[PDB]
Design a binder for this molecule. Structure first.
Ligand SMILES: Cc1cc2nc3c(=O)[nH]c(=O)nc-3n(C[C@H](O)[C@H](O)[C@H](O)COP(=O)(O)O)c2cc1C
Ligand SMILES: Cc1cc2nc3c(=O)[nH]c(=O)nc-3n(C[C@H](O)[C@H](O)[C@H](O)COP(=O)(O)O)c2cc1C
Lengths: 174, 174
C-alpha cells in the first residue's frame, strides 16, 4: 500500500512551508495520502475507527507538522491519545504499528544553529522530537530518521526545494 | 501572590493520582489556585485574556498533568500555543514569565526503573519533559525541578503520601 501522511497544522492557509509540502504530495495521490486532521476534524471529534482503518490500509506512516513550542500541534497530540489505543496500537493484541515505518516531517521557526549545545536552544532537534520517537518505539514501530526544515524570492525558492526534498525523502521511506 | 496550578487532565473523575493531588491543594486556596483547564474550557475555547491575567495575578506557575505518550494532554499543548503569545510571554514586550518560577507536577504510568538508559524507555524523565523545559526557558522563566510520581490499600496509602509530598514541593517552590 501507499504512505499515509497525518498532516497536523492548525492554520495551513496562512502556512507557507506545510502548504507547499502538502501541494507537492497531492501531486502523487497514488503513492501518498495527505490526511489533514484540522480539515477533517474541525471540531476535534476524531473518528477512531476511521483513523485506525486508514492506517491499516496504508504502509508507512508519517506525522507532518510545524514545531510549536518544541512540540506538536494539539490536535496531533489528541490524535495520538485517541487513536493509539490499547489492544490496537499496543498491548497483547495491539500490533497495528509493529514493524511499521514511522517518521516525522517537521518545520522549525528557528535556525538549525540554535538546536545545538552551543546554540540558543541548547538541545538538538532529535532531543526535541524524543516524545514521538518514544511513542513510535513503544508501539514497536520501525522509527526512521525525520525530515526537517528550518524557516523572499530566494527564500521562496528554498521552500520549493524543500518540497522537492520532502518527496525524495518520502520515496526513500517507501 | 500565590501559586497558580494549571491542571490539565482530560478525565480527572476517573483519575486517582491527580484527583488526590487536586483535592489536597484545594485545602489551601489562600496559597494555591487550582485551575482545571478541561473543567473551565470543556469546549476548548480558551479565553486568552483571562488566562494571561490569571498568571499575572499569581506568582509561581505550575503545570500539573498526567504523562500521555511521553507528552502532555492536548488541551495543555493548546493552552501553551494560545496563551504564550508574542508580546506577552516572549518577544520585545513579552516579559510576563521573565524570572517567574515555572515547574511541572506530573504522573507516569510506568516504573521509574523504565526511564533510564538500562530501562525499557531508554530515556530519563528529564529528557521526556524537555519540550516544556525549553518552552519555559525560551520565555526567560526560572524553570525549577519537576515533581514526579510513578504509578490497593498499600497503593492507596502511597498516593496519599504523594499528595502530601506534592504540598511540600509546592511550599518549597514558593
Ligand atoms: C504558538 C507558536 C509556537 C511556536 N513555537 C516554535 C518552537 O518551539 N520552535 C520552532 O521551531 N518554531 C516555533 N514556531 C514557528 C513555527 O514552527 C514556524 O512558523 C512554522 O514552521 C511555519 O509554518 P509553515 O511551515 O506551515 O509555514 C511557533 C509558532 C507559533 C505560531
Ligand atoms: C492515551 C494514554 C497514553 C498514556 N501514555 C503514557 C506514557 O507515555 N508514559 C506514562 O508514564 N504513562 C502513560 N499513560 C498512563 C498515565 O500516565 C497514568 O495512568 C496516569 O498518571 C494516571 O492518571 P491519574 O494520575 O490522574 O490517576 C497513558 C494513559 C493513557 C490513558
Amino acid at each position: 500500500p501507499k504512505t499515509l501522511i497525518i498532516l497536523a497544522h492548525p492554520n495551513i492557509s496562512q502556512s507557507t512551508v506545510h502548504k507547499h509540502w502538502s501541494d507537492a504530495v497531492r501531486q502523487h495521490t497514488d503513492r501518498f495520502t495527505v490526511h489533514e486532521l484540522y480539515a477533517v476534524y474541525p471540531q476535534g471529534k476524531i473518528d477512531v475507527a476511521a483513523e485506525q482503518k486508514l492506517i491499516e490500509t496504508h504502509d508507512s506512516l508519517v506525522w507532518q507538522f510545524p514545531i510549536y513550542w518544541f512540540n506538536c500541534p494539539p490536535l496531533l497530540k489528541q490524535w495520538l491519545d485517541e487513536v493509539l489505543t490499547y489492544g490496537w496500537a499496543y498491548g497483547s493484541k495491539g500490533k497495528a504499528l509493529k514493524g511499521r515505518k514511522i517518521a516525522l516531517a517537521v518545520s522549525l521557526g528557528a535556525p538549525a544553529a540554535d538546536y545545538r549545545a552551543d546554540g540558543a536552544v541548547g538541545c538538538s532537534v532529535a532531543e526535541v522530537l524524543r516524545p514521538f520517537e518514544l511513542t513510535a518505539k513503544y508501539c514497536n514501530a520501525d522509527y526512521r530518521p525525520p525530515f526537517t526544515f528550518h524557516t523572499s524570492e530566494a527564500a521562496r525558492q528554498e521552500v520549493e526545494r524543500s518540497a522537492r526534498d520532502y518527496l525524495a525523502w518520502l520515496d526513500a521511506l517507501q
